[PDB]
Amino acid sequence: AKKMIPIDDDKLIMEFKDDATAFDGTKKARFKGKGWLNAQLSVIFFKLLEEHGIKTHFIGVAGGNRLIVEKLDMYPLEVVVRNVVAGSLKKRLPLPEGYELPEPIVELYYKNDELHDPMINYYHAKVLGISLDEIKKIEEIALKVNEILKDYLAKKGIILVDFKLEFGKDKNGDIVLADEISPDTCRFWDAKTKRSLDKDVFRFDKGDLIEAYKEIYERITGEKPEF
Amino acid sequence: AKKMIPIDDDKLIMEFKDDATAFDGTKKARFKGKGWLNAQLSVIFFKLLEEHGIKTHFIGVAGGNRLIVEKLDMYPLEVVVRNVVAGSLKKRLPLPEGYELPEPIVELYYKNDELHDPMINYYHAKVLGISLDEIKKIEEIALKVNEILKDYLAKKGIILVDFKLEFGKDKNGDIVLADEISPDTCRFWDAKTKRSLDKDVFRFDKGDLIEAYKEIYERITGEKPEF
Secondary structure, eight states: OEEEEEOSSSEEEEEEOSEEEETTTTEEEEOTTHHHHHHHHHHHHHHHHHHTTOOBSEEEEOSTTEEEEEOOEEOSEEEEEEEEOOGGGGGTSSOOTTOEEEEEEEEEEEOOTTTTSOEEOHHHHHHTTOOHHHHHHHHHHHHHHHHHHHHHHHTTTEEEEEEEEOEEEOTTSOEEEOSOOSTTTEEEEETTTOOBOSTHHHHTTOSOHHHHHHHHHHHHHSSOOOO | OEEEEEOSSSEEEEEEOSEEEETTTTEEEEOTTHHHHHHHHHHHHHHHHHHTTOOBSEEEEOSTTEEEEEOOEEOSEEEEEEEEOOGGGGGTSSOOTTOEEEEEEEEEEEOOTTTTSOEEOHHHHHHTTOOHHHHHHHHHHHHHHHHHHHHHHHTTTEEEEEEEEOEEEOTTSOEEEOSOOSTTTEEEEETTTOOBOSTHHHHTTOSOHHHHHHHHHHHHHSSOOOO
């Protein structure tokens, strides 16, 4: 879905591709224009978060589907924030899809292909070299990001169901939001109909992925995508 | 492995059986005298913890393989403390069996047969009705229990690799250690040889289960079991 291209010690290129993968690599397809949409939406979200005082790796656009991003010492984590029950949570808590959580859930996943990205807690993280203070800072950022995105999206008739973040550390030792923010990494439901406007359309053949991602883009920007 | 028999609102009978189960019920066998050993060892450990100020459900012995225990509102948790890498941890962190942890790991598991007892974090626990203060108290108790047991066992040439606890709440709202403490619920390794003196002998056919459990009993008591 994405390619990283080194420029120097300070920055690199993050390039969004049209490739889509699901179910641990077993499902694959290419969607023309997906890269452009995910790149554009990431930029929109990064800029919004920066305005709200969230440090992100976003530096600038490099034309096409390319972003210039800050080089970081990456944490081997995927940080998932969940507002509504969906996806893997249904296999952890006996709650139905669509269940409204009384407060957000934050889950930490250890990025490790061989172990298939298992969930971890604060004690496992410490063994991996991540201090409890770092973990607390990471979850604090993720929860603030959640508030900003959910509020922003709700005013555009979209329910932020859940989303996945990655983080790294900059040269000052500050924790910086990295990776992407897109319909690939978030669950987005229409507020009126509850239908998926995200990667679940591809995961479960709910319709046309490109049309769903365009709809998100159009609702957010107020204009049709130019590509 | 165990049966619970209600007496009244204050207490019940916890009875230890000779049955052994492994790998989610797929492996079964009966070991003559296992119930007696697990009952006796639980009593020994409960008494030791009580002397060190740990609240446990232990009230008294009711002859044979029967303990009288306090009735509690049980938490739907299994709390696992790990000092040495073994078992399921090898599938979560890329560390070898026998790896010495820099500090103990505490894992919370949601007791739910349908979901196969998935691991959970503090956020999932809150959704299940368990406050962060309760979770903190539970882990504090578990970590203290760990120190007491590991110190006690090391002076008898046994390495406490890991163990599993359950807890409930008494009528005063205090958090009380429940279930059992035995070679069924702990990993015990000989300090000299590193060989299993616990349920792993049954799990992986490492030898005679009864002989292993007797050895633990003999090392702890200083005398051969009478049954």
